[PDB]
Design a protein around this motif. Structure first.
Motif, PDB file in Angstrom:
ATOM      1  N   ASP B 165       0.840  -1.188   0.000  1.00 34.13           N
ATOM      2  CA  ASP B 165       0.000   0.000   0.000  1.00 34.13           C
ATOM      3  C   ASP B 165       0.872   1.234   0.000  1.00 34.13           C
ATOM      4  O   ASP B 165       0.495   2.286  -0.527  1.00 34.13           O
ATOM      5  CB  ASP B 165      -0.867   0.034   1.254  1.00 34.13           C
ATOM      6  CG  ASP B 165      -1.807  -1.132   1.330  1.00 34.13           C
ATOM      7  OD1 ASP B 165      -2.716  -1.203   0.481  1.00 34.13           O
ATOM      8  OD2 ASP B 165      -1.630  -1.975   2.232  1.00 34.13           O
ATOM      9  N   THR B 166       2.047   1.091   0.601  1.00 33.31           N
ATOM     10  CA  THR B 166       2.976   2.197   0.732  1.00 33.31           C
ATOM     11  C   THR B 166       4.423   1.740   0.641  1.00 33.31           C
ATOM     12  O   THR B 166       4.767   0.645   1.087  1.00 33.31           O
ATOM     13  CB  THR B 166       2.789   2.876   2.100  1.00 33.31           C
ATOM     14  OG1 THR B 166       1.403   3.185   2.295  1.00 33.31           O
ATOM     15  CG2 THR B 166       3.616   4.149   2.188  1.00 33.31           C
ATOM     16  N   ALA B 227       1.410   4.916   9.504  1.00 38.34           N
ATOM     17  CA  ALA B 227       0.770   3.767   8.872  1.00 38.34           C
ATOM     18  C   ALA B 227      -0.443   3.372   9.699  1.00 38.34           C
ATOM     19  O   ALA B 227      -0.654   3.895  10.793  1.00 38.34           O
ATOM     20  CB  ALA B 227       1.746   2.595   8.779  1.00 38.34           C
ATOM     21  N   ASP B 231      -2.034  -2.115   6.883  1.00 47.10           N
ATOM     22  CA  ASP B 231      -1.192  -1.616   5.800  1.00 47.10           C
ATOM     23  C   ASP B 231      -0.041  -2.554   5.472  1.00 47.10           C
ATOM     24  O   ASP B 231       0.631  -3.061   6.371  1.00 47.10           O
ATOM     25  CB  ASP B 231      -0.586  -0.252   6.158  1.00 47.10           C
ATOM     26  CG  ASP B 231      -1.573   0.895   6.027  1.00 47.10           C
ATOM     27  OD1 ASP B 231      -1.195   2.035   6.369  1.00 47.10           O
ATOM     28  OD2 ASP B 231      -2.713   0.665   5.580  1.00 47.10           O
ATOM     29  N   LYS B 286       2.999  -6.420   6.973  1.00 49.15           N
ATOM     30  CA  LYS B 286       1.609  -6.017   7.156  1.00 49.15           C
ATOM     31  C   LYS B 286       1.436  -5.738   8.640  1.00 49.15           C
ATOM     32  O   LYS B 286       1.592  -6.634   9.473  1.00 49.15           O
ATOM     33  CB  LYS B 286       0.636  -7.129   6.739  1.00 49.15           C
ATOM     34  CG  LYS B 286      -0.843  -6.757   6.948  1.00 49.15           C
ATOM     35  CD  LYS B 286      -1.773  -7.937   6.662  1.00 49.15           C
ATOM     36  CE  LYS B 286      -3.248  -7.546   6.753  1.00 49.15           C
ATOM     37  NZ  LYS B 286      -3.652  -6.589   5.682  1.00 49.15           N
TER      38      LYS B 286
END
Ligand SMILES: [Cu+2]
Ligand SMILES: [Cu+2]
Ligand SMILES: [Cu+2]
Ligand SMILES: [Cu+2]
Ligand SMILES: [Cu+2]
Ligand SMILES: [Cu+2]
Ligand SMILES: [Mg+2]
Ligand SMILES: [Mg+2]
Ligand SMILES: [Mg+2]
Ligand SMILES: [Mg+2]
Ligand SMILES: [Mg+2]
Ligand SMILES: [Mg+2]
Ligand SMILES: [Mg+2]
Ligand SMILES: [Mg+2]
Ligand SMILES: [Mg+2]
Lengths: 334, 334, 334
Positions: B165-166, B227, B231, B286
């Motif tokens: 996601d990032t 975050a 994520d 994650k």
């Protein structure tokens, strides 16, 4: 025009050309360019300096490439650190003195000019504030070139499509640096201070320096241009203020548009061509032999004494059918 | 290559990554990037300064992201205000010392290098002028990273697609600031002046500072990374000159390519991984728990005394199944 | 958002607007903008200077144009040469004080904010560091406008589509330059030094200057706006801190959204409208007569003594049906 595509271009420094397509990949588009005017002293040669005024920090100004029928939108910026007003005259444009009458900007100002590139060919663009400022800004380095290619690419004298692998923009500029009685050159703190002395030299019509890419030897030695046997190189040559006679020593101009307008029939097999002061021309050549070549203004005094010489280093295999040393330099001596 | 699409990218400062797509949305393209070399003194810590030389004004240099098979065209600029020659070596490229042999530019010059990103993975890019200048420029801050993603995105050890996601680019850099006899650090007027003294420190192989994003505490406190629980964050870690052992205190490396080349099987469930000096690696995690995490070089002396510590603040709901304080700190005293 | 198109915009200086389409040519996109904060003293009038702080070097900051539903990604840069922290508050955005709580950057820092332009209309964006800094930065020049057009373009009170040929962004700004006892204005070395004295003037709520485009006479004389009979011109007017009452002397506001939000019914045939301090409004007018017009803040003292006057020069044919001098000024005298 809101229905026309817009393309933002990133200019590259001369003698190179920004990415482009020889054959228009689409219908007319609006080409967006941006340039920052930079006033700075530059070294033309050993012990020879010029209080220059430039488009985007280079001499010549960067090459712009678009296609006939496209529109050109130039954002010109005159930073607050500069000392004088500037503008731009596009020989490729129609009206208002090439755009000069609509782009006069003082330090700290910006302007955006749009014009339709209705005619194909290589054209000079240069500063022209007005009156005596016109020649002075130009010989101080403010001139570049914009190439307007036919939408269907270049064509030869028979209408056959011609293509190049590389474009080298050779911007030739004549300068008039004041000399002391002994021949040495004068230096000044800024452009304005040296104006009066520079005018005296300008009046003699004798340049102190005639250079490619803004300096003597800029494109020689480590700055030598590169190519390979088989390469079709298009040499676009501009001279905004004085005539030049380009020649590729060791080669030729396979197809040459000396007046630089592509819809005109090009001439073939030239040894030397002619670029009228205030114009840009173009010559295409396919390298057949490896080695060192000398691209020059063929008034050899201007080429060697004044600085109008560039070198091209070509890699590849030698062809003895074209040339061969039958008997090498030999003989008795004493 | 004239038939290939061209994409102009705008770089963002580390530890962030410019906009991109994990899965190539099209066939091979030519990625255009531009960077300005900036020489400037930077504060590494309280009373600790570095006469730095940087790519685009940051340490590490900005992260470039492209896809395997694409071409990369980098315009490198060495402004006239700088004092020394610079160039660029792309570990992702093939030939001419990573491009170093074709990009040596003096102050006031620019260069454009094109290379084909034939191999997927995170790679280091750094300055390497030649001889003693190589290590010196690198430890002065001239190094960054380019990530070449597989056209079909990242894959795990089983070939299953993985997505993040990032991306947080953690550029770790070792510096060798000269010390007075009392341990205090020396300051100089420019890079050249401190060279001799810096070499003496370099010879000990003991860094005075080891930092993330160019300074002690750069990514802690108000600079802490953010975050949310759930994520998937990809931590790309580079170290151009010295080994590092990244660890996410409070978490793990779900999938880790410590040698940083994506076609190789990643390892799972790591507590700490290894980044070889002269390379970039990548770890995906994650987040499962909210709170503060510490991303560090796990030689705790290097993390805390030298500066290799970043903080990550994660928002979300706590999961007691994973961890719970059964008995809080308690006890009589006197 | 990775599936949404991205468009990079190049801002142009006020009172002009960057290239755009009135009717969205596609679905939602992510609009990318970049601005550099520039602190510099500016000349408001003869013998009147302001230690200004600006967005992109202009007052007002440049106009951004996007469509309702699009996303806006602004990269804000605070160069190291600046002296104070800055940020940005978008009245068009939702949350974190318009983005102010996520964009506070010190000299040498950059930030990228993304927000969804959920509501159509012209909105003010301005700096707001916090506390006393809020009004001070704004009256020092840190304010601009972002126009969010309905995806299907502007509509009138009946829902009929309306289109303009040109947009002129008139950024009105009130300033409070300290005065000596004789009425002359004070000058300072930097913003901070003049703070205390400026606060005293601010407390009187009486501006020393009220200008368009950052200076008295900026848009008059040679800076006069241009148009032709028949042109539909949209005058977007912003005032981030104080009320204004725009009027086009010689014309009218054909359709006016004084509160500046496009889904609201516009009013017609206005002689003068009202822009609330802290807002941007818009007025559309079709020129019917050639000649000189005066766009002003209709408190004539503010227009003429304070500086809130712009001129519009319109070319075309005169219409005697609308107005005619039946009897020219005539009479005996002595
Ligand atoms: Cu000029
Ligand atoms: Cu000859
Ligand atoms: Cu370097
Ligand atoms: Cu541990
Ligand atoms: Cu501010
Ligand atoms: Cu009136
Ligand atoms: Mg530029
Ligand atoms: Mg002398
Ligand atoms: Mg031939
Ligand atoms: Mg940049
Ligand atoms: Mg000491
Ligand atoms: Mg997992
Ligand atoms: Mg800009
Ligand atoms: Mg006074
Ligand atoms: Mg009407």
């Amino acid at each position: 025009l809101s229905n026309l595509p817009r393309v933002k271009h990133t200019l590259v420094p001369p003698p190179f050309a920004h990415a482009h397509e020889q054959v228009a990949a689409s219908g007319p588009v609006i080409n967006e360019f941006e340039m920052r005017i930079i006033e700075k002293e530059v070294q033309l040669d050993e012990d020879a300096y010029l209080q220059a005024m430039t488009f985007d920090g280079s001499i010549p100004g960067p090459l712009m490439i678009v296609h006939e029928g496209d529109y050109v939108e130039l954002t010109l910026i005159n930073p607050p650190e500069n000392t004088m007003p500037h503008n731009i005259d596009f020989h490729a444009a129609t009206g208002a003195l090439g755009g000069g009458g609509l782009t006069l900007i003082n330090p700290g100002e910006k302007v955006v000019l749009r014009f339709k590139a209705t005619r194909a060919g290589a054209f000079v663009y240069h500063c022209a504030p007005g009156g005596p400022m016109i020649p002075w800004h130009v010989v101080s380095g403010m001139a570049g070139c914009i190439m307007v290619l036919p939408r269907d690419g270049l064509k030869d004298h028979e209408g056959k499509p011609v293509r190049y692998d590389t474009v080298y923009y050779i911007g030739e500029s004549d300068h008039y640096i004041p000399k002391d009685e002994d021949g040495t050159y004068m230096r000044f703190s800024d452009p304005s201070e040296g104006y009066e002395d520079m005018v005296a030299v300008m009046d003699t019509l004798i340049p102190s320096h005639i250079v490619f890419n803004g300096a003597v030897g800029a494109l020689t030695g480590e700055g030598a241009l590169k190519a390979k046997v088989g390469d079709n190189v298009l040499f676009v040559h501009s001279q905004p203020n004085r005539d030049s006679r380009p020649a590729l020593i060791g080669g030729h101009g396979d197809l040459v548009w000396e007046t630089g307008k592509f819809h005109n029939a090009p001439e073939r097999d030239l040894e030397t061509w002619f670029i009228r002061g205030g114009t840009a021309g173009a010559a295409l050549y396919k390298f057949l032999q490896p080695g060192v070549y000398a691209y020059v203004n063929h008034n050899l005094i201007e080429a060697v004494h004044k600085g109008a010489t560039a070198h091209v280093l070509v890699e590849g295999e030698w062809d003895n059918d074209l040339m061969e040393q039958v008997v090498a330099p030999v003989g008795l001596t004493g």
